[PDB]
Amino acid sequence: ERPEEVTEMQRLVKGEVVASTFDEPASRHVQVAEMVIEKAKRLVEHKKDVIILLDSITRLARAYNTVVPASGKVLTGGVDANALHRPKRFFGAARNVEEGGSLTIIATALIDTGSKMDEVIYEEFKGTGNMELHLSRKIAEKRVFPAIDYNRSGTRKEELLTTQEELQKMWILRKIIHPMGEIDAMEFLINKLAMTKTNDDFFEMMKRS
Amino acid sequence: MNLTELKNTPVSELITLGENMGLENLARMRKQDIIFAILKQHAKSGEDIFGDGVLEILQDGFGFLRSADSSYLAGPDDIYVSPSQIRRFNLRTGDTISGKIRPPKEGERYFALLKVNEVNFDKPENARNKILFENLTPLHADLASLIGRGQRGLIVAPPKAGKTMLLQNIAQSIAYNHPDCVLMVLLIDERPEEVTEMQRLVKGEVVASTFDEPASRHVQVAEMVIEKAKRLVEHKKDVIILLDSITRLARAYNTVVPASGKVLTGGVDANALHRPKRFFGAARNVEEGGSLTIIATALIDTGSKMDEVIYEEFKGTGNMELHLSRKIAEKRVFPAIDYNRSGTRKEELLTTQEELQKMWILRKIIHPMGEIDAMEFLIN
Amino acid sequence: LDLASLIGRGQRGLIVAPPKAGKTMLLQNIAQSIAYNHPDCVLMVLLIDERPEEVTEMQRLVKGEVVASTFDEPASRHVQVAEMVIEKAKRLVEHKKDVIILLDSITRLARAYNTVVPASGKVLTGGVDANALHRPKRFFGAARNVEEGGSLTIIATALIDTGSKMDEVIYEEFKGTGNMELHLSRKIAEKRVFPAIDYNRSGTRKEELLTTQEELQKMWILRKIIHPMGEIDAMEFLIN
Amino acid sequence: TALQQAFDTCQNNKAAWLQRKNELAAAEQEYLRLLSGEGRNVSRLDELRNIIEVRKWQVNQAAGRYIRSHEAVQHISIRDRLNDFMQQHGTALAAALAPELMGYSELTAIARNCAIQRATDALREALLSWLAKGEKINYSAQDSDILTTIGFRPDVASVDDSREKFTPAQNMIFSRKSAQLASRQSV
Ligand SMILES: Nc1ncnc2c1ncn2[C@@H]1O[C@H](COP(=O)(O)OP(=O)(O)OP(O)(O)=S)[C@@H](O)[C@H]1O
């Protein structure tokens, strides 16, 4: 990540933040990732809730690809077969331990970058995570933010993460949003939440209407 | 000792057994390495030791014993088997050994099998005269409705289409409707939470590999599970394989198999294409006793074209095809290539009565579902 | 071949074919299959408004009586022979005896009713009178099974894509009311088994967010069931 | 002699429903107390709402089971009192209702159930005419204590808390959540 972004992260987070710039080699990236994942595992071993925000898994996968020794089995775009094994483990460490504590990983991915490497990395990581969120450039072209594709996003097995009534409240919201266009849906949602004060207030406002 | 209960038990009391036995460096390595510490300490001690596992041969001569509860991974919990024992009991990969083993010594760092009490719940010399699968010609000499006995089934579905719950319900139906039959569930590169819920929800044993551990791991676990199925069907017990998914297993073999010099569409080679037919052929039919019935799952419209390529290559292999999307159902049921010819060829006009080799018996048939449609190709 | 294998006993059914598709000899084969397999059932071959030579061939190559109307006379003959055959069928029902009817064709009878029925002001797209609809509905629903003794059953014949517009409307309303409908041509098979109207309705909302089992209800099963021809697949549309 | 076991089952189901009500009330008041507080324990509030939902489902299930047990106790007591009343006055009832009764002995099932429904209708007008005086109806000899402890009708709370119904999907999800909560409590 660029140094100015690194220092902005430094100054805009309460928790500790670690970054390796593009100036430093890929071995630096992989060792930083190993340090972070090992520290997270050690902390969660003590029944601690650890959260890791990763930006980005694509660059980490590229660094692992360009640091791992070759194996003779290269995919399209120049991605080695066993190169992606290490990042997946890093992204597979996220779990909810029954003994105590949890390890949550929110890792962002890059798409439509004009690269075959990034596309291959996305395809190999597409069906892995259990929570997922798309953003789109064309929604941000209207400068309405956040540029979130509501219809195409979602979470799996959300039932265990919420109570009953608000679940079908959100289902009704999804049924309302789905026919609308994604830009239209986003602007509608922004306008509706603008005049409310709380998600519960928005829920009651939409169900009374 | 009783390795089954020693390994199956959780670490919560295995650790207490560890400090009670006389060990000091425990709760520090993986769950198999602490068993290796138990191995070394009891080798220092002395008492007759049982050894169980699924035997597998390695290319240079010595064999190992995979553990079902270990998700079929190689490690310190391996049973050394000498080539003499392999040749005297013509041992092949997949046998469930539950025999008498010996402590390690100078040269061998782990347990070594000395004799077998019973070969897969059968006497060793008694099973020495069993017919192999290949020379036994395939002939027939709710699981029952969907696939029955001896047939091969596959379920093609998109993501977020209830695949995991469908497999769950199939598993429970197998459990209570067919208690006598042996349940076996295999998962490929699935999420750890899904693996845990499969293991803790179904009655039968589950062998699963997560996406973190590499593709060759999936290769070896698939080989071990198919060999185990073959060696449980040899002594006339029926087994059902719950494979999820064939697409990811094909991906793993494609990304691990050495290139043959020629490439098909999707970056696949002939070896990775003719491997998966071995699993189906081993489950094609069983003759006199038991069965080997495989129900696999396949992924569609996942965003990458190679998985539709492998699906189209797997269109005709199975006999029962459970579809959850209309887009591929219409293609598989009604191929368009013949239509591409016919549209320009005008039903091929080869004979005035050539239309009586293409009928469709289109009855509405009754089932517990209730008055369901039916179709038939009378393609003479 | 056997009617019990295809049409069973007591339930109605249709077969629909395009022009130049092999109707006459298929009806012949069905006729002798009925004659040999079930000689007890009373054979009844019926023809409406077609060439006299084929009428003679039908009535000469079978054993049962063949009341038929060639294509010379007007449609009043066709309609009145329709009522008299249905009345004799009802009498045979009162006679405590099973009957099989091979009618050809119901599209011919339907549009004969259309061109003969008096005007009532209930016409629709294409000038199709409502009376010329539910009179054929009465005739087609008179083919119900006899629950007290014996079983009447009929096999229907319909023509499709004849270069006209009257036939497909009655075809789609038969589709709405059809019990079983054998098909020969290509496109109409997919039209029925995978309704394009339903597909467009679904696609208007794209992948509709059907909650819980509503998404899993739509199921498709292909079982390669054992058949005397050898491994004839059967495809079933499982719904909830 | 199954009536005593049925009474014991009704009693323990009532106790289970009452205790369910108690921890539901305790969780509710604790959640309101935490809401009154100024702490930022949002996750605590979310899991408290989950607890409220799970306990409400458990209370509904316990109330339904108690209602079923109450109905079973009433049915078995009515059946037993019916039997030891009919073993006394069967000849008199037969003499007063004879025609259809020896019609039953040799007529076909259609005539059998026609006579059955005629007799039940006749006794229906008989009861509705007899209840005109409406004197204080007393319980039986030995089942009076059981019927008094069980009561004429269940509690109003145990019936109004069961107005809401759950489809099998909700039943499955709440059973899974209750099992998870039981595992949490065990640890
Ligand atoms: N009969 C049903 N009963 C209850 N929930 C159902 C039923 N049918 C569908 N669902 C819901 O369907 C949702 C998605 O089902 P899943 O089985 O998770 O989909 P999926 O096919 O497994 O796709 P994956 O495995 O997550 S990629 C679940 O959250 C269920 O709540």
Ligand SMILES: [Mg+2]
């Ligand atoms: Mg699933």
